[PDB]
């Protein structure tokens, strides 16, 4: 090499690098609108949620905490915003 | 770093470390302890008068030969007994 664009690296390389080792560091996590069994609100759930998030007006589990990304109880839909 | 403080306010530690480590030098340690005054029968002097006590033949170390004809002398200054070589061919007849 010895010559490259350190200011405009390829998007593939930036997605390959660690979240802290990108050109400008940023989170690789996100939020999802989970389709609740009820209504009146669409619950927003963190992807790497440490909590077993329940519905706002119910008691059904939307996610189960894991090491990284949380589970989704195996019945749900989720919009990625 | 190099194993020593570089900070602008580390002059005390630098000079104390130098003071401590100067003791490992022979000349500095001898000078600061005054070894020549107590030890070294010539009490910090270049020359010393004495009275010859005995002619001795001291055999030279290996691989040499030819015993060196020194003299045991009692120094007038402090009474200590030292051995002095008599350097020339002969010259032991010149001392009694």
């Amino acid at each position: 090499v010895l010559v490259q664009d350190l200011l405009h690296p390829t998007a593939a390389s930036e997605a390959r690098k660690h979240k802290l080792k990108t050109l400008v560091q940023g989170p690789r996590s996100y939020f999802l609108d989970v389709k609740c069994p009820g209504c009146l609100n669409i619950t927003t759930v963190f992807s790497h949620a440490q909590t077993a998030v329940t519905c706002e007006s119910c008691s059904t589990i939307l996610c189960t905490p894991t090491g990284g990304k949380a589970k989704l109880s195996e019945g749900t839909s989720f919009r990625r915003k | 770093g190099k194993g020593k403080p570089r900070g602008l306010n580390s002059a005390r530690k630098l000079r104390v470390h130098r003071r401590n480590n100067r003791w490992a030098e022979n000349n500095y340690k001898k000078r600061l302890l005054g070894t020549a005054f107590k030890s070294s029968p010539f009490g910090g002097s270049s020359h010393a008068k004495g009275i010859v006590l005995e002619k001795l033949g001291i055999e030279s170390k290996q691989p040499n030969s030819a015993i060196r004809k020194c003299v045991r002398v009692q120094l007038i200054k402090n009474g200590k007994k030292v051995t002095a070589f008599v350097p020339n061919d002969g010259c032991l007849n010149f001392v009694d």
Binding site: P27, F46, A49, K81 | -
Partner: protein, 150 residues
Amino acid sequence: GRMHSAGKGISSSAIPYSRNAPAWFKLSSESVIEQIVKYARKGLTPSQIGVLLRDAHGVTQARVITGNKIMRILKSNGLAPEIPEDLYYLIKKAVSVRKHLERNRKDKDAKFRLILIESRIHRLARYYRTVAVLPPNWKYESATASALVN
């Protein structure tokens, strides 16, 4: 890193470059503040308040959304604890380690860990006394450690 360990782990949160609330977030700043106060009155520390806010709600950062940090909101609303959260949990950990040491007395590893935890506690308390968070005569005492957190 790892002030009392050999680890060099870099795992940490990488907050986004954006200092403004996400577009998809529609909840009011006063609403999320009210939920923060509700959780605090329920007894949650700022760490668990932020965890619940980001897990079960859509609030990404309380600073970027409400213009104020969670602990600052609690102090302004008069819910600040007697001692800071991190110091309180360090003291609780020390109390647990000491309570295990009393009943074991042979866990030299536990004694070493108690020494490490108490050193961290003393350094944190020194910092807090310096910034006047704790009283200038505040002192952590092992014989009275438990009574300060329970």
